[PDB]
Design a protein around this ligand. Sequence first.
Ligand SMILES: COCCOc1cncc(-c2cc3c(ccc4c5c([nH]c43)CCNC5=O)cn2)c1
Ligand SMILES: [Mg+2]
Length: 290
Amino acid sequence: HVKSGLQIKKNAIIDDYKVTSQVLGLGINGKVLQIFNKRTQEKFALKMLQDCPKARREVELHWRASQCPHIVRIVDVYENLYAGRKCLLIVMECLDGGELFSRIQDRGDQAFTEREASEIMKSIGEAIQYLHSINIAHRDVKPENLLYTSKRPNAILKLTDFGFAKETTGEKYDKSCDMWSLGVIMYILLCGYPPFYSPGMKTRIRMGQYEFPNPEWSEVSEEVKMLIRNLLKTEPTQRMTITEFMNHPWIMQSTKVPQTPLHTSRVLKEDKERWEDVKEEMTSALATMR
Ligand SMILES: COCCOc1cncc(-c2cc3c(ccc4c5c([nH]c43)CCNC5=O)cn2)c1
Ligand SMILES: [Mg+2]
């Protein structure tokens, strides 16, 4: 199987796009902006990286991944002087749907089911599987990097930001922290809070306590808890791999998973005061996992 290599454009990007000033997010090495094609008037996202060997490898690895149905797509890459710095400008497909958990938290009826958690986990897992099978580890899988293509209920979930991705050839355990990220994301999808030991808020997980508290976890199957314990296993030598994950009946047959009603959407609203703290705890943790 043969895919073509990245042809970087040298002409001024502004010959092709109107470049606005609105932020669409904040990345590892820069800011994402809103732009429009001129000849089609269509909308797109732009990432600006200052040219250097690191940015070069981010663009390459992301390019290898681009065609995966669940990874954000690269439309073109420009090499320009942009405000007196030499930059790689990355044009990507626009993702209006928003961030994964933001969309779940905004559900007016608050009815999120185990079956939906499963389908979401299946989408993310396909992105990780694509990457791991060509020996790339993403290494920044977390809430702000999982976005929906449109606001439609049927929108596709996409993984973004390759600012930490690396080639793993030889060092295979670089892939493990991606699997841990899946464990954490799956756990949050099922109850509405992280499996972390941490105001006028409820404490969801007491320090040192059994990790599936009865209020939210009582109707979840022991099978699903075992899946999670495998993903969150402490030793990378023992943690589940992406192949084992994608072969688990809970992911493989996500179509036929119990539509068990979950507390997730409800807890995301109640605890939204501490969401930034969750994302921070995961960012810190991830820095020590990878
Ligand atoms: C606050 O989010 C709610 C959703 O808001 C919108 C609205 N319109 C477009 C986007 C968007 C963000 C992107 C992206 C392609 C790549 C990336 C990256 C980020 N954000 C993005 C941030 C982190 N790293 C990225 O590469 C493509 N599109 C997002
Ligand atoms: Mg893609």
